[PDB]
Structures are given as C-alpha cells and as structure tokens.
C-alpha cells in the first residue's frame, strides 16, 4: 500500500481531538511575543518562531553559523532551528495549552446549537452556567434534582448540606464538558424510540426527530461529545498572518495576530492566578474573558464585537477568512488571477477569416515570451536563456520571424466581460498585425454582446497539447457556428453585410442593361464593373444549379432563370450543393439567416463556414459600391402630418365640453381622450409608410409607379440591417406618448418628430423615459446575472452518464395555439427530440415510423404532409439514470449536427441558454369552420336587455359538421353570454360565446325589485370606480377594513315584488337573499327592477420577475382550488359565505375534509361527481397543487409553457429541453409514505429511493416496498440539499455547512463539477469525464 503518495480521492471533515491538535503542532506558543525592535527576527517562543515553525531565510539558521544549501534537515544545538526552506513557515502549525476549558463558538452560538440539541437544553440555560451565574446538575440519584437542573449559589448551598458526597454539580464550562462526559450515546437513542410509540404528535414531532438525526449521525462517525469544549487551541502558520516590512518602512500585520495576543495574555495570567491565591470572583472573570478571547479569534461577529488595537474596525477572524463575499473559499472561482493573459480594445477585421483574429504584435511577443525562448535555442540562433532574453528586449529583426512560426497553428482564446453564455470565450488562430489594438471578426461579434466603440476583451493563451486541442476541437468559432440555446445559427451577417446583399438582390423598373441572354454568371460581372449594366433590372441569366441526389451527388439541372444581374454574381458565392431558389429572392436578415441554416444540414460543417466568410467579403464590397447615406432629405415627413394632428387636437377639446356638462364623467374622460391620440399616432405612422415605403413614381419604361423605394432609411429597415420600423416612427412621423413618474401616460403626446425642432416642454417630457429606461438597464444586468447564477448552482452537478435509458416514456408535445393562432408548429417543437413511441397516425400508406431515433431536419418534413398531432417524446424529466441524463432519451445537441455525446455537462448549458437572452426581457370563442352549435347541460335564461346568460357551473361547447362528427372542444365558465342555442347553423368567422375575462359575475334566479338590507353606507360598503362596465359602483369590503361601529352586518341583496314582499326562490319557501362576499363590486342601485338573468355583483380575481417566480415555485396570492379524491363528493355545513368540502369515495376508511375561504366562486353546485384534479376557482394555479394531484407530468409542462410565454412576447427562441433539465433538478428529493429503513419524513432523492426500492424488493433483507411521493423544490430550496460540503460552502453560508459536516462526519468523494474546481482537479465533464471513469471503477476492487 502507498503511504507517501499525496494522490487523494476523498476529503472528510470531523471534530478535532486535543491529542490530534498536538499532532498538527510542532511546538507550544507560550509567549505573546512577535519580533524584536532592534533586529527584525522572531523571538523565543512567540507567534513568530524559527524553533517551532521554521527559519525566516532559505536554508539558514538565526545566528548565521550554518550557511549554504549543504546542510539539510539539521536541528541546531545553539538555536534549535531546522535548516530547511522558508516555505515550512506556511505549512507548520502550533498549539496553545488552555489552563481552563473554553467552549467553541461555532457549536454554541450557531443555530440551532449543536451542544444544545445534543443535551436537550436551551441556550439560555447553557450560557448562564458557562458565563458563571448558576450551577448545573450532572450526576443524579436520590437528590430530587435529577439532571440538567439550574441552581443558584444560594440554592446549591442548601442542597449540598441536605445530601452532598454522592451529589455532583459543577460551575462553568468545566460543568458542560463533564455533562458531555457522563452522557451515554448508546442508551439515549433507545429511550427516544420507545416514547415515540403511543404519543406521536405532528408539529412537536419534528424536534424529536431532529434529536435522533443528530445522535445517530454522531455515533456512526465517532466524533465524541467531549471535544466540543476546546482544551488545546491550534495556531495558524506565520506566513498566512505575516509581519512584513513595506516600501516605506512601517510594518504591516494581520488582524489575526492582534487577536492571538489577546488569547495568550490572559492564558498566562490564569496560569499565574491559580497558584498565586485564587479568589473565585477574579478567577471566574479571567475564565470569562478567555472564553471570549477564543470566541473573538474564531468568529468575531457573534458574541460582542472586538475592536483592533490601532484601527477602528472589526478584526478579520478565522471565520472571516473563509466567508465575507471575498475570502478564501469564494476567491477560488471569482477572484482568480491568471498568467499568460492580455487585454486590449477591440477593432474590426474584415480581411480576416472566421478562425482568424488580429492579435497585436507587441502583445503577442509579450504573451508567448517563454515560447520564443523555447524555439530560439532550438533553432541555434541563441546560445542560452539569458542570450535569448537580450534578443527579445532589443526587438531584433530575426525574433519577429520566429514569433510568427510559434503563433501559427497555435489557438488563442478570446474572452469578453460579461460572459452570459458559453460563446463568450472562443478560440482563434492569431494573425500578427502592427498596432496596440486587437482585431475581431465581424461575424462572431454577434455571439458576444460587443460593439466596436470602447469594448475590451481578455486574451488567454493555452499551454499544453490537451489545452490546444480542446480549443480547436471544441472552443473554436468554426466549430461553434450554431447557438447552444436554439437550432438557429448564431453567426449571422448583420448591418453592413445585410445592406450589401439587399442592394445586390433588389430590382429596379428599368436600369442599365435589360433583356439580355447572358452566358453564365461570369458575364454578369463583366457588365457591372466595366460600366455597361447595373446590378438591378430583370435580366435573363444562364445558370447551372446542382440539386441533392438520393445518394449524392449526380444531379446537374441547367435552365434559364429570370433574375437580375446582381443575383447572378452572388450565385458564384453560393456553393454547388444548394438550390438556386434561395438566392432568387431579395435577401434580408431574415433571408440570409435561412441560407446558412439550410447549408448546414444539406452539406455539412466545413462547406458552410467557407460560405459564411464569402458572404461577408462580398457583403462589404457591394455595400461600399452602393454608397448608402443618411441625409436630412431622406427623413421624409408624411404629406398631411399636421392635418391629421389638427383633427385630433381639438377633438380633445370636444370631450372637454362633455367634462363640464356631465355627458362623459371626469374618470371616463382620461381613458377616452388617450384613445384619440393613440389612433392618431398610428394614422401618421401608416401615412409615413407611403412616402417612404414605395415612393418612386418616376418610371421611364411605361407609365407605372409600383416599385420598392430606393430611400436610404427604408433600405436599413426593410432588410433588417439596423433600425426597426419603431425607430423610423419617431424620426420622420411622430414620437408618440410618454410616461409620468407615477406610471400613468401624459394627456398630450409629443407631436414634433426628430426631423423638426422639439419644444422645451416636449424635450423635458421625453427625458423621463430616458432616465427611467436606462436606470432599469443599469440593474437589468445585475438581476438577470443573479438569475443566471441561480440556475447554475442547482443544475451544475449534472452530466450524461449512460448512452440510453431503458424507459419508453416521455412528454406529450402539441403545437402551441393561443385562441385561434399557431405560435410554433410541430416541426420546430419536435426538432431534435427523440420519440418514445412509433407514429401511428393514418393518412398516407406506409409501414410505420421507427422509434428511438433522431428526428433530422429532413425527417421532420415527412411528418408535415401527414399532419401529426400529440407525439410523446423522450425528455429530461422521465429519466431513471442513476445520477444524470441518458443521452438518447434526451435529444440533439443544438450547437452540433447530431446527438449529444456523453460526458458533456447539460445543466450548465441549460442555465446559460436562459440567462443569456434574459437581458432582452381565449376570452371569446371564435370558430372558422362551418357547422352547428350543440350544447349540453344548458341552464340559460333570457334577461330584459337580451343576453342569453347561462346559470350553470360547467358548460362545454361542441360543433357538428356536414357528416355528423365533433370538430372542436372549448370550455365555457360561469357568467357567459351565448350567441346561439341548441342546433343552430354558423357562418365562417363568427363568435358564439362571449364573457368578460377578468371577473366572476353573480347571477340571480328570481325577478323583481332590489332591496339593500343591512347595506349601510360607510360602515360596510364604500364607493369608488369599477374598471370593466364601468362607471361609479359600490365596493364591498372584507371583514378586516370595516369600522368598529358596524361589526355584525351581512352584505346581502334582497329581492322583492311590486308590493314589497319577498319573491320566493323556486324550490324552498325561504326568502330571496343573495349573500355577497368580500371584494365584490355591486353595479345595481336601490329601487331598480331586474329580470331573471341580471348580474347582481361581480367578484374580482410581469417579465423577468415572472420567470424567476415560476422557477422558484412560489405560490400565488390567490391559489386555485382542486379536487383531491375521485368519487361522489358533497358539501357539508355552512358559516356565512363559505363551504366545507367533504370528500368521501366508496371504499374503506377514507376520512377527508376541507376548508374553503368565503369570497371564492366555485365550479360545482350540489351533489357532483368530481375527479382528481379539477378546476373549482378560475385563475392562476399553484405549482405544488398540480404535482400533488395531476401528477409529475402536467406540472412539468406547466413550467415549460408559462416560462416560454414570457420569452415568446419579447421575441426570444429557447428550446423546451433546456427548461426541463432544471425541472428535473426541482423534482428531486421526495417524501416517503411507507415504512422502509429510516423514519417517515426525512429527505431522500427520487433516484436514491429508486435504488432503494430495487434493492429492498428482491434482496438486501428488507422485503418492504417504500412508497414515495414526489416533492417540488424551487432552485434555492433544492440547492441547499447537496450531498457535498465543499460544494455547499461555495455559495451557501459557510459556518453552518462546516459545523454540520463536522458533527455528522461527512465525506466528499468529489463527483460534482464545482467540487473539483475548488480543490484544483479535473472536471468530471467533457475531456476529464473519460479520465474520471478510470478512478471510479477501481473503488469496488482493491
């Protein structure tokens, strides 16, 4: 067995023994001395020592008698110093022998007290003994005091006289150490398990289970409770807490050195006082501060706060070294300084290739400094290292030639701050260019958030062959042409390149040279650059296009095409294996991006990279040839701008007449006036797109006018190069409406555009949105950056383990349709996904579509003709793969062109794919197909106005076509108006059902007058404004905001006839009195007659924070109520306006009841057969409620759809596979129902229980089948439950984790990615994954 090999695999943490501290130590620190004032050297036996810790000089003694590297490991007889290197002062430690036992602060003050839970004693009782105020009973017999009893000095005196001798009680920290000495761990666990048999409890059970979990973990590791109180105190090495002379001459010392002195000082005094007369008052006080001295040394920010001897600052304690945002544990990742690194301002590089960057000459000479010396002595140009150093410094002409040789074929990484996704660091092969600025490729600039105006980039250089290869094979820009977030390419031409291809492809009416036959695309270049024909005009060209063959490649179709001169030249740029139809159209940013996407799957990776550069070179050349210029005349104002404004300007003054008269109220005016300017702003914008969009008119050939305008501004907007249609609105047409500091919109918008001079008032108005929008942007990076940090820490420790997981189960995927519009088709949704079950849809004759296969970009085209719906594909959620993803049962790699290879970290990509683009962050049923409306469970009643309002809780809508079959299915809620009844023919494009989306109306049954009984104004009801009908309406307040005068009053509307007597409700002889709940808004007045079907009262129900809320699994303000057990369910009893739901099935036992709030409107009336997971209260659904009842599938698709809806509105494309990775990290950790091996509640992983259930049911001597229920933990609730203390203390609170690891005796085997970064080992992901498998396999055998 190896003994001296430092190659470790696992690290463990436990409590240190007083004898174990002496093993670390090499001597005892007895003096508080440091350094002499005369000669700057260590003193005798102080903090700084050469006899204990090591010599200050390299291989020398203190006196200077022993010199030269001759002597090694020689213990001096004159001084006592070992002749060794001074690095020994960094590793060697010391010890301080304490005269009195002092308690540890980490186990005492840190909640919920490690010493307190172990002894079953509150902190108030422990501290009063420790601090020396009261005695505590340790040993018990027949002394009436039993155990842990707190006794004062006057109580202890009388108790000893009555008994004594056999009775044992001590005072101070000595008593606590003796109390932990006497306790038996083997017998305490047996007693607690016996009492948890008859009296179990529910809420008080948690503290009883906490004690067992603390005691059982204490014995299995073997820490011993006696070491909780410190007797020997370890000392840090002198190098970590140094006294170094600065440049000026004044010394600089650590705050730890000042703390250590105030420990030894009173330690030496206590050793004196114990033999030089010991009065209790002084001795207890010296022990009082000595306990505080260690407390201030370990963790200063707990008991009091120590002040530095010279400075007015809290001293950096031993705990403060690890934590504090920037310490030692947290600087392993963030605060890491790196050699072989550069930094300069970025510049454009149009002459460079995609794999090439323009690295500065003087920077590269400095960076590859050791690389120059290596290939200079090898060439025979320089004699030695020092001679090679002189040649570099003198800047010799021959050095520049060798420099280029080393840089060639050597990749260099380029990093930009901040890195949101992985493409922020890309490798490039440098080309030497003279200058102090670094040149970057224009195409890869789209990957970063970079702009050539004042941005800087870090220049990193790999050193080893392994580092050079993983930069070329993985981190190279040519290899990373696609984005990891979505299947669309990230390297897409922008600005100048788009404008160049747009002008080249666009056509004119009659340009120079039209109607020629042209021999090949070569003659198209012959006419333009010579000066005989323009790029525009429709001219026939002979072209030879090559289509893809079934085997490839023999198809060569030649035909005459009707294009332009410019389109023919661009075909030469287009590779052979691509159709001509893709370049035939006028190309913009939307069209050019489609060229690279099609070129990738059809040809490969290599052909599209060369093509990508070829577009860029040609893009800049023809953009320069065109000469696009933004002029003041190009900013065309609509012909009748002020004419439209004047029609809407005094139209506001027309409603100002209604403001004073009383036709339109003051509250209704503001929202009516604003609609005029909103319509006027759109009218000017639409009129702007006539004098700018197609304004040409002058045509030489014929008399026509139809042509796309050659305006410089429109060319930048139509192509999508720079500036959208929204930007052109403000400059030429109208700026629009601005906001107020409160949030409301200003009455009069800015009429003046940027073409004309803005007013002083108008410009001050526009500044508010400028200093508010940019203020949001200043904290947008901080908020989205924390969101990126949040998603990583929970999913980072997730890598691909197996090639295929043995489950034919996944998620049902349907194209997202909102109301009657398709957002994303099946092709874009199921692209990349691997199917779990074969396609069984009938349409065209075939022999089945194979399962467990990758859906290609060409394979998905076959599914489009057949029109397939609802395909269950293998996803990240449904995985039984030990600890990770199962490759095949996941999907394609979006950056690559095939399946994702095993070893790649999915969770890190999944977190970056959402955090990066995060910076940019139904009501009426309409039918198109002709048929007939058939209704079931109809309870409609016609009112006085003429609205068919239904008086039923559950209503469904169905359509019957020509043949006689159901077409569409839609749900109709309570309080809805139907257009047509049962069996009525509908036309193509007609609304059949209509209701207000954000309200819950209450419908009456009996007709007559309305009485306001117990409806006193001011006491129960208040007046405001309803924002739906609307006007002034009564608002009913809940039982919380009501006055002290009207305490017992029920808000209810009473229905009477013409005489004044109550009209009875059909069924019961009870008077008609509809009790109205809280929050409800009453629209009706006193004395107003209503018919059957009239509404009495209506009951009311962001961006980045919404995404953060869904991922954190936080319950909404108004959670939806759902039925838990299926069967015959009926209501029970009444209170005021609330119902207690009693759910009882048919079978045995089944005791269940529920309590529901009063204001809630239900979807069931009386005696209803309800199933598991049904909507009772309409609105938002609670994330925990869906998992509880609907299952572990409907909740997973709920997280996907709700998050995507936020990104769809903003215009962001993120795949559904990235979200479901984090969902799997939310579903982990489950609660056990059936008794297995340990407890009932606890916290065990889903797969940890799946390994358990597979082992218990067959072998392992258990035979019990542990039933488990899935639990949901939103990121931060799941990231705390990591099975590593090194990974936890990285982002979590350090002092809590290190104490928990010490007590339990945890072992970190280093499997997570974050665990190996801190220790300085290879990552169990990617290249290091194949390395890591070699060591994990040899743990079982050996």
């Amino acid at each position: 067995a190896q003994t001296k090999t430092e190659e470790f695999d696992a690290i463990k943490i436990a409590l240190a023994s007083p004898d174990m501290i002496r093993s670390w130590s090499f001597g005892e620190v007895k003096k508080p001395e440091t350094i002499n004032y005369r000669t700057f050297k260590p003193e005798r036996d102080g903090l700084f020592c050469a006899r204990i810790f090591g010599p200050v000089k390299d291989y020398e003694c203190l006196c200077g008698k022993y010199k030269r590297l001759k002597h090694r490991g020689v213990i001096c007889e004159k001084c006592g110093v070992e002749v060794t290197q001074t690095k020994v002062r960094r590793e060697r430690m010391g010890h301080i022998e304490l005269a009195s036992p002092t308690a540890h602060i980490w186990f005492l003050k840190s909640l919920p007290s490690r010493i307190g839970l172990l002894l079953d004693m509150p902190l108030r009782d422990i501290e009063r003994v420790l601090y020396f105020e009261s005695y505590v009973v340790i040993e018990g017999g027949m002394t009436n005091l039993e155990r842990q009893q707190i006794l004062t000095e006057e109580q202890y005196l009388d108790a000893l006289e009555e008994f004594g001798d056999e009775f044992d009680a001590k005072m101070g920290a000595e008593a606590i150490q003796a109390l932990l000495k006497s306790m038996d761990l083997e017998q305490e666990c047996e007693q607690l398990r016996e009492e948890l048999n008859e009296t179990n409890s529910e809420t008080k059970r948690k503290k009883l289970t906490k004690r067992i979990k603390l005691l059982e973990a204490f014995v299995q590791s073997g820490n011993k409770p006696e070491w909780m109180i410190l007797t020997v105190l370890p000392v840090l090495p002198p190098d970590l807490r140094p006294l170094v002379p600065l440049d000026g001459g004044r010394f600089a010392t650590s705050d730890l050195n000042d703390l250590y002195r105030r420990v030894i000082n009173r330690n030496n005094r206590l050793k004196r006082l114990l033999d030089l007369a010991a009065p209790d008052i002084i001795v207890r006080n010296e022990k009082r501060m000595l306990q505080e001295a260690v407390d201030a040394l370990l963790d200063n920010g707990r008991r009091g706060r120590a002040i530095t001897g010279s400075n007015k600052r809290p001293l950096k304690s031993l705990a403060d070294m690890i934590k504090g945002k920037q310490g030692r544990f947290r600087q392993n990742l963030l605060g890491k300084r790196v050699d072989y690194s550069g930094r300069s301002v970025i510049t454009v590089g149009p002459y460079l290739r995609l794999h090439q960057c323009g690295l500065p000459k003087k920077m590269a000479l400095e960076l590859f400094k050791p690389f120059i010396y290596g290939k200079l002595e090898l060439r025979g140009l320089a004699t030695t290292i020092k001679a090679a150093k002189k040649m570099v410094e003198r800047e010799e002409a021959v050095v520049w030639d060798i420099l280029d040789e080393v840089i060639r074929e050597h990749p260099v990484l380029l990093n930009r701050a901040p890195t949101l996704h992985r493409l922020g660091i890309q490798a490039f092969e440098p080309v030497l260019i003279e200058g102090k600025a670094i040149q970057l490729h224009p195409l890869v600039c789209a990957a970063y958030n970079a702009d050539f105006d004042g941005d800087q980039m870090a220049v990193h250089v790999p050193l080893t062959l392994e580092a050079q290869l993983e930069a070329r094979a993985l981190m190279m820009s040519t290899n990373n042409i696609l984005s990891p977030a979505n299947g669309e390419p990230i390297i897409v031409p922008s600005q100048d390149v788009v404008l160049g291809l747009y002008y080249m492809t666009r056509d004119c009416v009659n340009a120079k040279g039209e109607g020629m036959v042209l021999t090949g695309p070569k003659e198209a270049e012959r006419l333009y650059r010579s000066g005989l024909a323009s790029l525009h005009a429709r001219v026939k060209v002979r072209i030879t296009e090559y289509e893809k063959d079934a085997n490839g490649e023999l198809v060569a179709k030649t035909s005459l095409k009707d294009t332009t001169v410019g389109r023919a030249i661009l075909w030469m740029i287009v590779p052979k294996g691509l159709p001509y139809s893709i370049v035939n159209q006028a190309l913009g940013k939307k069209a050019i991006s489609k060229m690279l996407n099609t070129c990738y799957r059809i040809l490969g990776l290599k052909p599209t990279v060369i093509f990508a550069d070829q577009i860029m070179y040609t893009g800049f050349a023809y953009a320069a040839r065109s000469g696009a210029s933004v002029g003041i005349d190009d900013m065309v104002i609509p012909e009748k701008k002020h004419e439209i404004i004047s029609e809407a300007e005094a139209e506001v003054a027309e409603i100002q007449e209604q403001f004073q008269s009383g036709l339109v109220t003051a509250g209704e005016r503001y929202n009516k006036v604003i609609d005029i300017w909103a319509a006027a702003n759109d009218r000017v914008s639409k009129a702007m797109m006539d004098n700018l969009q197609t304004e040409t008119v002058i045509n030489r050939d014929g008399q026509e006018e139809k042509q796309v305008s050659f305006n410089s501004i429109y060319m930048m907007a139509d192509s999508g190069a720079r500036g959208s249609a929204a930007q052109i609105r403000q400059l030429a047409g109208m700026r629009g409406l601005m906001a107020k500091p409160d949030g409301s919109i200003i009455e009069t918008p800015i009429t003046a555009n940027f073409r004309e001079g803005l007013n002083v008032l108008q410009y001050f108005i526009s500044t508010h949105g400028a200093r508010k929008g940019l203020a949001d942007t200043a904290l947008k990076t901080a908020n989205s950056g924390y969101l990126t940090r949040r998603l990583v820490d929970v999913a980072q420790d997730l890598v691909v383990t197996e090639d295929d997981c043995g489950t034919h189960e996944g998620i049902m995927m349907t194209p997202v349709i909102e109301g009657g519009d398709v957002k994303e088709p099946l092709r874009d949704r199921v692209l990349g996904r691997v199917t779990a079950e074969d396609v069984l849809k009938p349409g065209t004759a075939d022999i089945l579509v194979p399962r467990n296969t990758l859906l290609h970009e060409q394979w998905c085209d076959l599914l489009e003709e057949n029109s397939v719906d609802a395909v269950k594909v293998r996803s990240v959620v449904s995985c039984d793969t030990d600890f990770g993803v199962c490759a095949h049962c996941y999907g394609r790699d979006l950056a690559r062109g095939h399946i994702i290879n095993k070893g790649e970290a999915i969770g890190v990509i999944a977190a970056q794919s959402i955090g990066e683009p995060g910076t940019q962050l139904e009501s009426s049923i309409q039918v198109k197909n002709k048929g007939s409306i058939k209704l079931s469970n109809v309870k409609s009643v016609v009112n006085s106005s003429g609205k068919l309002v239904i008086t039923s809780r559950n209503t469904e809508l169905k359509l019957i076509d020509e043949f006689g079959r159901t077409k569409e299915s839609y749900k109709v809620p309570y309080g809805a108006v139907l257009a047509k009844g049962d069996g009525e023919q509908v036309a193509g494009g007609e609304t059949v059902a209509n209701w207000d989306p954000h309200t819950m109306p209450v419908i009456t049954e009996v007709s007559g007058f309305v009485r306001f009984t117990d409806m006193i104004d001011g006491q129960t009801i208040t007046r405001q404004t309803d924002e739906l009908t609307g006007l002034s309406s009564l608002v009913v307040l809940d039982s919380a905001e009501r006055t002290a005068g009207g305490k017992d009053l029920r808000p209810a509307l009473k229905i009477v006839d013409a005489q004044g007597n109550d009209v009875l409700i059909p069924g019961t002889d009870m008077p008609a009195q509809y009790f109205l709940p809280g929050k409800a808004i009453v629209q009706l007045e006193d004395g107003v007659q209503i018919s059957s079907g009239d509404t009495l009262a209506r009951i009311p129900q962001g961006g980045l924070p919404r995404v953060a809320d869904l991922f954190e699994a936080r319950r909404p303000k108004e959670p939806a109520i759902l039925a838990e057990i299926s069967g015959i369910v009926s209501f029970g009893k009444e209170t005021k306006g609330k119902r207690r739901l009693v759910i009882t099935p048919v079978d045995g036992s089944d005791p269940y009841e529920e309590m529901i709030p009063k204001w809630r409107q239900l979807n069931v009336f009386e005696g209803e057969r309800v199933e598991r997971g049904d909507v009772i209260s309409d609105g938002p659904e609670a994330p925990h409620d869906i998992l509880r009842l609907r299952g572990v599938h409907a909740v997973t698709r709920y997280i996907v759809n709700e998050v995507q809806d936020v990104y769809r509105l903003q215009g962001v494309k993120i795949n559904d596979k990235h979200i479901e990775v984090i969902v799997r990290q939310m579903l982990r950790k489950a609660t056990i129902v059936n008794a297995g091996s340990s407890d009932f509640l606890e916290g065990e992983q889903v797969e940890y229980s799946r390994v358990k259930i597979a082992n218990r049911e067959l072998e392992a001597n258990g035979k019990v089948g542990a039933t488990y229920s899935r639990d949901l933990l939103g990121i931060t609730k799941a990231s705390l439950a990591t099975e590593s203390f090194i990974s936890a203390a990285s982002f979590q609170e350090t002092t809590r984790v290190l104490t928990e690891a010490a007590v339990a005796g945890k072992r970190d085997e280093l499997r997570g990615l974050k665990e190996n970064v801190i220790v300085g080992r290879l990552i169990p992901a990617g290249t290091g994954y194949a390395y890591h498998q070699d060591r994990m396999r040899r743990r079982a055998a050996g």
Partner: protein
Amino acid sequence: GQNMRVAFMPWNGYNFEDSILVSERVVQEDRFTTIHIQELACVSRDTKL
C-alpha cells in the same frame, strides 16, 4: 478636439459597428496629436542593511 471631413458611407468592413476610418493626412498633419506629461519618482531609502 477639432473637426474633420465626414462622409456617411459604408466601407469594406472598416466601419462595421460604430467604427470610424481616418486618412493618413490626419496623421501627417498634426490635428489629433496629444501631449502627455508623465511624472516618475525615484526614492532612495534607509534600510536595516
């Protein structure tokens, strides 16, 4: 900081994103040459050696 002749036109990738070109005449004629005065201090100190 003086004024130069400005033409708003695309070039061969030398004005991709906010990038600005300059003539050799801007370098030949001292119109953007800046004078920078720097201070460097040398301190002789007394040590224990």
